[PDB]
Every structure is written in structure tokens, then in C-alpha cells.
Copies of this chain bind each other. A is one copy, B any other.
Amino acid sequence: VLSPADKTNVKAAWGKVGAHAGEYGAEALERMFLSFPTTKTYFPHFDLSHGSAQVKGHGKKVADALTNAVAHVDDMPNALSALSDLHAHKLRVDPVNFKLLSHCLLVTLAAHLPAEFTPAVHASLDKFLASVSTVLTSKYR
């Protein structure tokens, strides 16, 4: 469960992301695809080449959803209902993959927000991505 310190830590870190959230979304996708090629199985219809507009667009979409999640950190289940649905009944992404994307997002944040990626903030963002993962896979069965 996210403690008040966690929530603050997350709000802070994400605050610094700002107008780059989209780029970081796209970058995390690219690192996932290259590091865990099994993840690519879910995107047969995309051009997964570097700098692909499909990848960029999707990166934005994910980034945007994360933002809305930070903003409703106290009410995630509710803020992500629609998304929980899409994932459990339409996309049906295996749950192990949420852990891969979460890891690539940390790696991306670390590389871009050195001053802000402290041990305490690292711990909070990790818990955070884990909660978001839990919410997104809660209606699977």
C-alpha cells in the first residue's frame, strides 16, 4: 500500500517528468522490446523500428495514463477502470509483462532524472508501478 511519503515521492518525481512524459513513455517501450523480445508478440501490427510513429504515439498514451494515475493516486482502481477492462477482456496481456514494462520505466527515469532518482524515490516509484500493475490485472479472472 502506498504510504503518504510514497505518494509525495511519486508526485514529485513525476512532476519533474513534465512535457517529456511522452518521450519517456516511447523510450521505455523501446527498451522493453529490445531487452524482452517476447513483449513484442503483443504488437504484431506495429512498426517496432526505432523512432516509429506507432511506438511514439503509444508511448504518449501510456505516459498519459500514468499521469492520470499519479493525479488519482488515492483512487486508482476508479481512475483506471476502463483500462483495467480493456486489458482484462480485450488485450489480454499476460501479467508477467507488467513487471517488464515497470522495470524499463524505472531504468528510463533513472537515466533522465539523476538528481531525483534517489533510493527512497526509487522504492516509491517501484511500489507505484506495482500498484498500477495490480489494478490493470485485477479483472483478469
Contact = CB atoms under 8 A, between A and B. Distances in A.
3 contacts: A1-B138, A123-B141, A127-B141
Interface residues of A, number: 5
Contacts of A127: 141
A141 B119 CA distance: 14
Nearest to A126: B141
Contacts of A141: 123, 127
Interface in A19-74: none
A97 B127 CA distance: 19
Nearest to A123: B141
Interface in A84-141: 123, 127, 138, 141
Nearest to A1: B138
A123 B141 CA distance: 9
A75 B113 CA distance: 42
